[PDB]
């Protein structure tokens, strides 16, 4: 299959990546160098045109460059670890809230058998849906435009849960009840205060606790001057993991 | 889903995790405290017995505590990112060599639809099969006890490839040939020397180059004394990613 | 400059450093390889005997390998930054408490013109003096065996202060008074809880606030296999810096 | 002593530091907020006016915000560790080249008793002098405008050396000869290629080898949302340290 028009492509030029829809007679220009989308439409993946390499985007590239952000997203750095740390596969059901823009959801969807997501704000609920539908994702996802505390969530049936909210300690009882015995949970908390607060509240519900931070550092890809890049993302969030306690 | 005899359990006591097979009359003793396995048979996951929390192990815990190591392994820190970075799902076929102890393979197998894996050393080839089989994994894996260079491999059948060998640059042409157009490739390299050498020749075959290292720092999960651990894994390997260029 | 009987030497063997007194008739053995100290005495610095390289220790090696530890110490990774971040030189007077084992003191002493140090525990007060004198350090230091709250400290004579105690917020007013206008202050705090607590109480005393953590990753020094070490120190403490606000 | 006109002051407003010369009638605007210098002149350090805190700058702030950069500089993160790692004090003479903009020099000058620095490029030689002079530094520094290879330097008179050039391996024999027995040496190298090459070259001249990289992560200083900053400096350089081997 060759490059069709109207489809989103990943363009590499120098150190930088670009995501662009292949619309006729439109172009990408970067520092005097021009790539015309008309020369791309009809070519295979991995073509080199005037210094521009063109491919179809991966899941990581789709999330980072394709997804509209109406809220703070969970980056692949974290979500690629989270999905598999939650011990997910195609035999498993996972609970997520809040959906936000669907950045974590896209990864949970790709790994798990079934996802139930909850998002209180209607705008973000529509945005996450749009994001995933746009890139052919989320066919195993049930979206709910409701506050998790008000939702009717089937008790004792989820193989895992992941919580991304400001104050997750207000939802611990219900999350606990939604899960199967011994099931993994994960929490995303940007702040140390939130983590301390969650650790104060979690003891009745989840054991085998783990808190981890993930750092990625990229390197220059030039052979003769191999070294780390000048800057890196320093922090996205503390990741909190546990396992359901019987009670 | 209560604990049955002979099955593997993950035990947490204090800061430590233990993986133990549930054998009759046998026990686990740490710092005086004893956990008798007869007392855990018939109990649900997330039961707490004498300060010991017991669960079934996750994929990460299986790899780290359960897999027999005849070689250096690829750690979940890296492999969880690798599997999804390579854009894998159930519709994808992935190439891997060398199999080694099967630690990366276990993750590839869970994420991908199909894996072809090559290991030249017979005892490593046997250990990898034993590792995954012991934990009910690798049902979608084709194991080959041959040097990849001698293998009969149809061209353009792989949606992704991952290479973990001392000198990957010798295999670039065959891997490129075995991949479908524009397909992701990844390389595991422990030393900067290897990365530098790979970067000399790689651009004849693969573009959209990325080199990243992944660091995990774990935290004390005590609410009142929240802080990072004393020590961490500093380095496992440099990860280099690319995409098949059309030749 | 030849090695004398009884002096402390830094011995390097393979990847490892050793600090030893040059005692006659004595030896160091590592992996069945033997260094005889009689062969070292009377030799120049930087001799190599039986694979062992022998030098006089530096400030960092003295603190790390030579100082007796009765308390948690401040490591050179932090202390080398701290002393210069506090803007110390030979025309500066610095306040420090608690002295502990004198590990930070050694650095403050080397950089600043004079140091007033306070330690409430007399066993620790004595150990710190023993450490420093043993290695010909601390001639510019006034040691006090007193609680800092009870100490007779002249107001406005200190160019900087550093506080290493469990609950530094109790002593803010007195440290503030002891400091010259706009003078730098630093705090060492192992936990996030402690930093959060100091930050809410420091508001009316110190401004230009900074919190930093310092990570050192070491590398293999083998040319053909250049890569980071397997393990590193993950955390020592958060460092909090401010400047005296005029009240 | 209150602020005088013509003084360079450190101004803190929100998260940002500013270094400005106190010019009468002049101001600093941060968006719509204004600080009038006429209100600062005649006031003590640590004064707060309309949200702006004003101090005199420390060595770190002088280097980072005050020094004119005509080369790549060595940052305080590295130089503060370097100066004390080289075991410098007021009884030590240190060799340095190339001087560059004088950022490392300022620190060596503050710590050592005497510095001999060499810079081949006349412009940078003048820049380094102008930088230190402007902030009342470097009175113990001998500046030379010459290639180190061509300079007449007394044998065995340096207690330490630091080398910041592209290819330091060329100067090893001379640096070695200029050093006292057992003396520390340091090298700054941006790339792994350079480190690899130096390690290949250094074996006959320097032992007790160490390679380290230093990372600083800064934190939000808001009590109720304590977390690391979003971004950090990922890499400045690899730091190589050794000790003179007897030849
Ligand atoms: C930081 S965003 C989640 C980002 C998401 N993980 C991603 O990767 O894009 C937090 C979201 O949770 C939603 N939320 C907060 N509390 C909720 C609740 N009680 N029930 C359902 N959604 C909630 C908010 O509306 C917000 O959109
Ligand atoms: C470091 S181990 C791989 C570890 C594995 N990735 C894991 O996670 O457990 C590398 C293995 O590749 C094998 N190997 C090297 N070259 C090979 C080749 N050309 N074909 C097949 N196997 C090869 C070696 O026998 C060795 O066991
Ligand atoms: C962690 S140790 C300091 C270690 C020291 N910075 C070093 O490098 O070796 C803390 C010390 O502070 C002392 N201390 C606590 N409160 C004090 C106070 N109010 N006045 C004097 N010393 C105090 C304790 O006795 C203890 O020795
Ligand atoms: C990276 S800059 C030095 C930066 C300096 N360490 C600082 O902190 O500002 C390298 C300098 O070394 C100088 N240089 C290179 N080779 C030299 C040599 N053989 N003798 C003297 N200077 C040399 C260059 O002119 C250049 O200014």
Residue numbers in the entry:
A (entry chain D), B (entry chain C), C (entry chain A), D (entry chain B): 2 to 248
Sentences from the paper on this structure:
The N1-methyladenosine residue at position 58 of tRNA is found in the three domains of life, and contributes to the stability of the three-dimensional L-shaped tRNA structure. In thermophilic bacteria, this modification is important for thermal adaptation, and is catalyzed by the tRNA m1A58 methyltransferase TrmI, using S-adenosyl-l-methionine (AdoMet) as the methyl donor. The methyl group of m1A58 is transferred from the methyl donor S-adenosyl-l-methionine (AdoMet) by the TrmI homotetramer in bacteria and archaea, and by the Trm6/Trm61 α2/β2 heterotetramer complex in eukaryotes. Therefore, the m1A58 modification of tRNA is important for stabilizing the L-shaped structure and for efficient translation.
Here, we report the crystal structure of TrmI from Aquifex aeolicus in the complex with AdoMet, determined at 2.2 Å resolution. The asymmetric unit contains four protomers (A–D) and four AdoMet molecules. The A. aeolicus TrmI protomer consists of the small N-terminal domain (residues 2–58) and the C-terminal methyltransferase domain (residues 72–248), which are connected by an α-helical linker (residues 59–71). The C-terminal domain adopts the typical type I methyltransferase fold, with a central seven-stranded β sheet with the topology β9–β8–β7–β10–β11–β14–β12, flanked by α helices on both sides. The long β strand β12, in which the head interacts with β13, is characteristic of TrmI among the type I methyltransferases, and it provides a surface for tetramerization. The ultracentrifugation analysis, using 1 mg/ml A. aeolicus TrmI, showed one peak at 110 kDa, which confirmed that it is tetrameric in solution. The methyl donor AdoMet is bound in the C-terminal domain of the protein. The N1 atom of the adenine moiety hydrogen bonds with the main chain amide nitrogen of Phe149 (3.0 Å) of A. aeolicus TrmI. The N6 amino group hydrogen bonds with the side chains of Asp148 (2.9 Å) and Tyr172 (3.1 Å). In addition to these four hydrogen bonds, the adenine ring forms a T-stacking interaction with the side chain of Phe98, which is fixed by π–π stacking with that of Phe149. The methionine moiety of AdoMet forms three hydrogen bonds: its amino group hydrogen bonds with the side chain of Asp165 (2.9 Å), and its carboxyl group hydrogen bonds with the main-chain amide nitrogen atoms of Ala104 (3.1 Å) and Leu105 (2.8 Å).
